[PDB]
Amino acid sequence: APAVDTAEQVYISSLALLKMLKHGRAGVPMEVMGLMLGEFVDDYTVRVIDVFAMPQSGTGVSVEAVDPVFQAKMLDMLKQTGRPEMVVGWYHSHPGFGCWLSGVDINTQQSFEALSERAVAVVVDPIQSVKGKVVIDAFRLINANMMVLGHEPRQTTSNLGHLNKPSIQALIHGLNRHYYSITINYRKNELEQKMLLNLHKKSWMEGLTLQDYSEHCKHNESVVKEMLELAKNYNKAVEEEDKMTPEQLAIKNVGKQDPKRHLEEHVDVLMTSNIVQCLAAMLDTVVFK
Amino acid sequence: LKELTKQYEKSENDLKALQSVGQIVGEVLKQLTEEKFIVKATNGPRYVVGCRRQLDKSKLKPGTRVALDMTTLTIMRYLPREVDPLVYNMSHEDPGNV
Amino acid sequence: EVLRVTHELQAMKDKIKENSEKIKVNKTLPYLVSNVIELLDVKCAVIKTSTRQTYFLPVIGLVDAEKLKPGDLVGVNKDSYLILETLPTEYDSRVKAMEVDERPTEQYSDIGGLDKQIQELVEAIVLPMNHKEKFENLGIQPPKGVLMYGPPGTGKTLLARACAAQTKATFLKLAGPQLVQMFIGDGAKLVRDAFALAKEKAPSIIFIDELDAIGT
Ligand SMILES: Nc1ncnc2c1ncn2[C@@H]1O[C@H](COP(=O)(O)OP(=O)(O)OP(=O)(O)O)[C@@H](O)[C@H]1O
Ligand SMILES: [Mg+2]
Ligand SMILES: [Zn+2]
């Protein structure tokens, strides 16, 4: 009996994430859908490389929304450019819902699995993935006839509990019962990350600018005054030195206050700013005439 | 061809419109900082909302109606004050050109 | 050259066909029945959906601009909240149920003692409605309405049907205690549709009994 081991990882390329999230956020109020291009290289990993967006239709996210003529023409056109990949699966956004599958999504994944029994389905929520966290969970239908054996039919491995823990938000909608998650792994390599780091890279001009001296002096004076008040507080606290269980005194007055947190951390920032400014100024007086 | 040209341009405008999405009409009630506002939807909760870059900070005074995006929850453009014959006082009565 | 024009016609015909199929497959159903409150200029309308939520539209959508008017009841998408198709009014069916033409014929012989009041109503309506040419010639503006104030049982409803009886008209009765509906924006729609219907028909009278139901 063939089985999808939990060590099977669906490889998503760097381009795939940016384009899939872009498609999700472009048609965010509705549920967008599209077809993912990839290769079933082996049993224990499913690699997707590129993806193209299925045009939005009033049906929503269903097998009807898949337009045969559009996908056929797109596949033929992409074949000439140097992308002879095979239909590897489908993705659809779940705005604010989370990472799970509806009954209609269940049937849609079933229809995809008819062509190939590793047709993965992934979900991308553009709203929850608003920061460094990207909520994207891949799913493949588990056959309802496999209840006699163990669901998640995996075999010798150790990566079932790693990289994720089955979410409560998705467990109640059916996990390890009708569909099971697949560990997500992103194929990022050099010559791709380096191009991506240019999002916020500054330039040669940055690092030599002297900021503005008027507001630099204003900020320095403000930080010095706040340090003077904090030093008054430090003097009071230290000179208090109350000895009725001083260890408990240090734990009954923890509210992110005077002693050290609003201490040298502020000295840290002012000293960093001052040394950086002075070093930059000296470097400019050296280089520029 | 010409009539087809006009109606096809109109149909393409309609096709572009189909992608366009709505904004919740909201009202600014406070300005915490120069990127922070307290906008209340017409019938909805209050959200801490930012402003689009191509928008003047000053114009969004307390009481300025706005139409923020309903996914990112960020102001996109100002709207003038709502007008309706909902006034409960006699001001809307015209004395008559006598 | 005529074959070139024919080829351009066929090409733009299939282009029209594909854009029309895209529009049709993006129309679908259902539509959120929404009431357009107003139309701001700076091709964008402020819609208040039936879900008691307002949604500004950057573009009007699959309709034409000057067709939409403040107060038009249209159908919009449930998610994108964009105008898809204008919904015909047809004055509902309840509004057309109030044009009752089985007037029980309160002839002025069936109302006694209320003689000067009958003549005052016939000076305020009927002749303004029937013999209007002299009314325009004089310059006497006929009052558009009359308020029937009196102690209960005086016969205000009776004389209303009376002057609806012997003076023809359609008698679009719009009694006040009817004009209170727990559905939001139904009574107001009822009044506006009643007046629009009165505009549609022949000379008629809009009659509202027990105005206190909305007149408080
Ligand atoms: N002047 C009148 N001549 C003949 N019948 C009358 C007269 N005034 C009242 N009636 C009769 O008395 C009853 C009063 O009902 P009606 O609704 O017509 O009066 P109303 O003063 O408008 O009532 P309400 O204020 O309670 O709505 C009716 O049955 C009507 O026929
Ligand atoms: Mg009465
Ligand atoms: Zn879905």
UniProtKB/Swiss-Prot annotation, chain A:
Gene Ontology MF term list: endopeptidase activator activity; K63-linked deubiquitinase activity; metal ion binding; metal-dependent deubiquitinase activity; metallopeptidase activity; proteasome binding
Q: Could you list this entry's UniProt keywords, alphabetically sorted.
A: DNA damage, DNA repair, Hydrolase, Metal-binding, Metalloprotease, Phosphoprotein, Protease, Proteasome, Ubl conjugation pathway, Zinc
UniProt binding sites for Zn(2+): H92, H94, D105
Q: Which InterPro entries match?
A: JAMM/MPN+_dom (IPR000555), JAMM_MPN+_peptidase_M67A (IPR050242), MPN (IPR037518), RPN11_C (IPR056263)
Where does the motif JAMM motif lie? 92-105
Organism's domain of life?
Answer: Eukaryota
Q: Where is the signal peptide?
A: none
A Gene Ontology biological process in which this protein takes part is: double-strand break repair via nonhomologous end joining
Q: In which tissues is it expressed?
A: Widely expressed. Highest levels in heart and skeletal muscle.
PTM-bearing positions, type Phosphothreonine: T245
Q: Which GO terms describe its cellular component?
A: cytosol; cytosolic proteasome complex; extracellular region; ficolin-1-rich granule lumen; nucleoplasm; nucleus; proteasome accessory complex; proteasome complex
- E.C. code: 3.4.19.-
Which positions carry Phosphoserine?
S129, S203
Q: Which PROSITE patterns match?
A: MPN
Q: Report whether DNA damage shows up as a keyword of the record.
A: yes
Family annotation (Pfam families): JAB, RPN11_C
Q: What class of enzyme is it?
A: hydrolase
Q: Which residues form the MPN domain?
A: 10-145
- List, alphabetically, the PANTHER family matched: EUKARYOTIC TRANSLATION INITIATION FACTOR 3 -RELATED
Q: How the protein assembles, per its UniProt entry?
A: Component of the 19S proteasome regulatory particle complex. The 26S proteasome consists of a 20S core particle (CP) and two 19S regulatory subunits (RP). The regulatory particle is made of a lid composed of 9 subunits including PSMD4, a base containing 6 ATPases and few additional components. Within the complex, PSMD4 interacts with subunit PSMD7 through their respective MPN domain. Interacts with TXNL1.
Q: Which family does it belong to?
A: Belongs to the peptidase M67A family. PSMD14 subfamily.
**What is this protein called in UniProt?**
26S proteasome non-ATPase regulatory subunit 14
Curated annotation (Swiss-Prot), chain B:
* Protein's cellular compartments: Cytoplasm; Nucleus
PTM annotation (N6-acetyllysine): residues: K40
Q: Which domain of life is it from?
A: Eukaryota
Q: Which family does it belong to?
A: Belongs to the AAA ATPase family.
Q: How does it assemble?
A: Component of the 19S proteasome regulatory particle complex. The 26S proteasome consists of a 20S core particle (CP) and two 19S regulatory subunits (RP). The regulatory particle is made of a lid composed of 9 subunits, a base containing 6 ATPases including PSMC6 and few additional components. Interacts with PAAF1.
What role does this protein play? Component of the 26S proteasome, a multiprotein complex involved in the ATP-dependent degradation of ubiquitinated proteins. This complex plays a key role in the maintenance of protein homeostasis by removing misfolded or damaged proteins, which could impair cellular functions, and by removing proteins whose functions are no longer required. Therefore, the proteasome participates in numerous cellular processes, including cell cycle progression, apoptosis, or DNA damage repair.
Protein name (Swiss-Prot/TrEMBL): 26S proteasome regulatory subunit 10B
Q: From which organism does this entry originate?
A: Homo sapiens
The encoding gene = PSMC6
Q: Which residues of the whole protein does the chain here span?
A: 33 to 130 of 389
UniProtKB/Swiss-Prot annotation, chain C:
Q: Which cysteine pairs make disulfide bonds?
A: none
Family statement: Belongs to the AAA ATPase family.
What residues of the intact protein does this structure contain?
58 to 293 of 439
> At the top level of its lineage, which domain of life is listed?
Eukaryota
Describe PTMs of this protein: Sumoylated by UBE2I in response to MEKK1-mediated stimuli.
**What is the name attached to this protein's record?**
26S proteasome regulatory subunit 6A
Q: Spell out the subcellular localization from the entry.
A: Cytoplasm; Nucleus
What disease does the record describe for this protein? Deafness, cataract, impaired intellectual development, and polyneuropathy: An autosomal recessive disease characterized by early onset of deafness, cataract, severe developmental delay, and severely impaired intellectual development. Patients later develop polyneuropathy of the lower extremities, associated with depigmentation of the hair in that area.
**What is the protein's known function?**
Component of the 26S proteasome, a multiprotein complex involved in the ATP-dependent degradation of ubiquitinated proteins. This complex plays a key role in the maintenance of protein homeostasis by removing misfolded or damaged proteins, which could impair cellular functions, and by removing proteins whose functions are no longer required. Therefore, the proteasome participates in numerous cellular processes, including cell cycle progression, apoptosis, or DNA damage repair.
Quaternary assembly: Component of the 19S proteasome regulatory particle complex. The 26S proteasome consists of a 20S core particle (CP) and two 19S regulatory subunits (RP). The regulatory particle is made of a lid composed of 9 subunits, a base containing 6 ATPases including PSMC3 and few additional components. Interacts with PAAF1. (Microbial infection) Interacts with HIV-1 Tat.
What does the entry list as the binding residues for ATP? G150, P151, P152, G153, T154, G155, K156, T157
Query: Gene that codes for this?
Result: PSMC3
